[PDB]
Amino acid sequence: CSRILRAQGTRREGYTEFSLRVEGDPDFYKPGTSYRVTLSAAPPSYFRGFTLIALRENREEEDHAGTFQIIDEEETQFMSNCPVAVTESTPRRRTRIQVFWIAPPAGTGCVILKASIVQKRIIYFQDEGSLTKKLCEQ
């Protein structure tokens, strides 16, 4: 599929009012361990849609680390447009979203989880910042 899935995006680098983080906040990952990933929207702010992927550091095809597992089928789904991505299942307002992610085999290096966010019309995305989480193996 594509990260060219973006054609209507506004790039917004840095820390924003939207945050992608992992519950427990691990400094490092452990191959085959299932971490809970959450996408959050701070004080009087909300989102209506999003996307989510994982990638090995430095890599920009089939270079996606680990696998996602759906927790809330009323909120999330795998995108039939891009199967390696997790996205919203309804454009209804949310302040939180959660998904499982399972750590890739021993010695896969560093992994970045990236999210994009649509609030009203605008789709926001970035390479570095609060919608981005890098996790390494050691």
From Swiss-Prot:
Disulfide bonds join C1-C82, C110-C136. Highest expression in lung, lower expression in brain, heart, kidney, liver and testis, and lowest expression in pancreas, skeletal muscle and ovary. Not expressed in spleen. It is found in: Secreted, Extracellular space, Extracellular matrix. Residues 1-138 form the Reelin domain. Cell adhesion protein that promotes the attachment of spinal cord and sensory neuron cells and the outgrowth of neurites in vitro. May contribute to the growth and guidance of axons in both the spinal cord and the PNS. Major factor for vascular smooth muscle cell. Binds to the central extracellular domain of APP and inhibits beta-secretase cleavage of APP. This is Spondin-1. It comes from Homo sapiens (Human). The chain holds residues 44 to 184 of 807 of the full protein.
